[PDB]
Amino acid sequence: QGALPLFDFSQSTLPEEFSFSNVEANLRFECLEIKALSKKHFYTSVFIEPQQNWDWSDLGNFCFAFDARALDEHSTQMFINIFDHQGQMHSRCINIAPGKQQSFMVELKGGGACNYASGLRSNPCPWGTKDVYATWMWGALNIDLSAISKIELSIHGSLLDHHLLLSNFRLQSSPAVDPNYLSGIIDRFGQNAQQEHAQKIHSEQELAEVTKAELTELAKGPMLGRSKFGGYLDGPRQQASGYFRTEKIAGKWSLVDPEGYPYFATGLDIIRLANTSTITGIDYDHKLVTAKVASEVRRAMYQWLPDYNDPLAEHYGYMRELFEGAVEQGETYSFYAANLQRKYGADGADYMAKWRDVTVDRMLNWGFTCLGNWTAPEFYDNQRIPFFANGWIIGEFDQVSSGDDFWAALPDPFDPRFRQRAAATVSQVKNEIKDTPWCVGIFIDNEKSWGRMGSIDGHYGIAIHTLGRSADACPTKAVFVELLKTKYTVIEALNQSWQTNLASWADLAKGVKGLTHNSAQVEDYALLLEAFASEYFRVVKQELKKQLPNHLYLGCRFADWGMNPEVVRAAAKHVDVVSYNYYKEGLHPEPWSFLADIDMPSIIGEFHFGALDSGFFHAGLVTACSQQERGQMFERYMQTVVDNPYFVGAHYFQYIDSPITGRSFDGENYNIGFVSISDVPYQPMVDAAKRVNQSMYPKRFR
């Protein structure tokens, strides 16, 4: 086969299939010229809809493809969302670099379709190819190809406009990939063997040279201008409480350090080794109560793994997880740990202790004012740089959900057991931080499924599902009944409003399903969701303050798909700082409108930028065309937070590159580190960090 054109751009006008939103379009010389107005508008889209659904299930293995040029100085991250008649969505993205024309391919059949987002069940797309194979991001990998109803080219969450040239839309046959395509792709350092890039390590000798060089550079000391606790030495002095605290300063929210210096929190997440391990293939399995070929394909990717008598075999580990009557396990290895020993462990030297010292040396030299979330407790007595503490509340207690699933269930805070587990969590954080003023604050939990805005069932899923449950073993449902009874008093009044025929409050309490979700019911879902969340935040706040009354409670780190006005207002009642994770190009004005009404000091828990020029298969959630642009985008993001008067900090996820073969736990495989897997700092990230960190305090504080 080969290629089959979908359209004809020879004509004076665009084909009827094309429409636009917040995109200016002109068809000219067989190129579709688009200006996405994404600086102003959060969502911009090109829509391609056939009048009658496409049937592409008879084509064999193929890609939807097109060519693109970006005429800006910066790249464009573009999502290609392909929808079928059923509604499910195949979503991939591409980075469109400035310069020569690129060809882009979105593989819809190959299984199924090729991708690097499935861990050991990935089927590699061609890499190092001239066609760019789009990265699978969201939705379903395999959709109903017999009834394809829409394609969306989306540019969103950007700080800039983008000017693209699109041409040569086509269906293109996809050749089968060699099963041993990636054999020997990883070298002994964990790096990509078949790729070269500016800071790649080629030998232990070069490793020692580069290390010696950095250590000499770090001998130049910390970035200047900071007080002891990393606040702004020459900033408007505030009262000192002896602990990090919040304050409104010249009409902006601010943190204040223990000695009263104004404080703004910059730093990195995951300062620990636990997330650096990757599956070796040895003993890899996934079964109930082939994995074997997946096992052998993975092991053959490694050019080197240590003999079990090799001192570097110390960094082997083992994973064994149970989930859904299925056990998944395997040997793991951390090349990062191995490289630490290579770098620092000559003559039985304590390489972990050196790594800790250099890490803190690095943060202070780069200008960061803290160590971020998931910092190893070994760092907590360092007394040179502030840190953020974290705990998880787990164990046995009643739960609520959005579905019978309980896949991502939340705790029922009206179960007495939840409070006891919160106490346990707090006791361990207290034992870790030993009341030190160097602890800026404590995050509890992370990215719960509070409800995804954009649809009733998603947004108020917790309200809707819980109403379906019986109050006898669901404390939150009992609370919901008393809430509705207080609002409506008699069941007849609820029936009038809900258009239901319930016999009594007891009838409600037993469970109601198949609700039509009218406007009155949705007002009630909102009340219910907020009451539920308010008690979670109340109980956690209380248990924290009983043992650690002086330390900031920083919330639960809202993901953008796990937040809504209801749970934000609930958090605002009880947290000291509201925490958000936000993987976009920066704090785009449109979705951050609500900040004023809440008027709480806020903190970014996570963001990042990745690329593919350091030999990775996945550039992550927000992407750049090069290492240099990663640093540029880091800076652009940060300016945006420093400029926002409700934010008091931003933490970058994460310190260390993901393994190229993926994190053992979940397969996370992004080029997102400040340092490579060989512990080499990416220079434009370091440089951007320094520009941000040296400018932020004078910019912030007038």
UniProtKB/TrEMBL annotation:
Q: Which domain of life is it from?
A: Bacteria
GO MF, any single term: beta-galactosidase activity
Sorted UniProt keywords:
Glycosidase, Hydrolase
Q: Which residues form the Glycoside hydrolase family 42 N-terminal domain?
A: 416-585
Hydrolase listed as a keyword: yes
Where is each Agarase CBM-like domain found? 8-182
Coiled-coil intervals: none
InterPro entries referenced in this protein's UniProt entry, alphabetically: Agarase_CBM, GH, Glyco_hydro_42_N
Return any one Pfam family short name. Glyco_hydro_42
* Disulfide cysteine pairs (residue numbers): 114-125
Q: Which GO terms describe its cellular component?
A: beta-galactosidase complex
Q: One GO biological process from the UniProt record?
A: carbohydrate metabolic process
Please state what the protein is called. B-agarase
Q: Which organism is it from?
A: Agarivorans gilvus
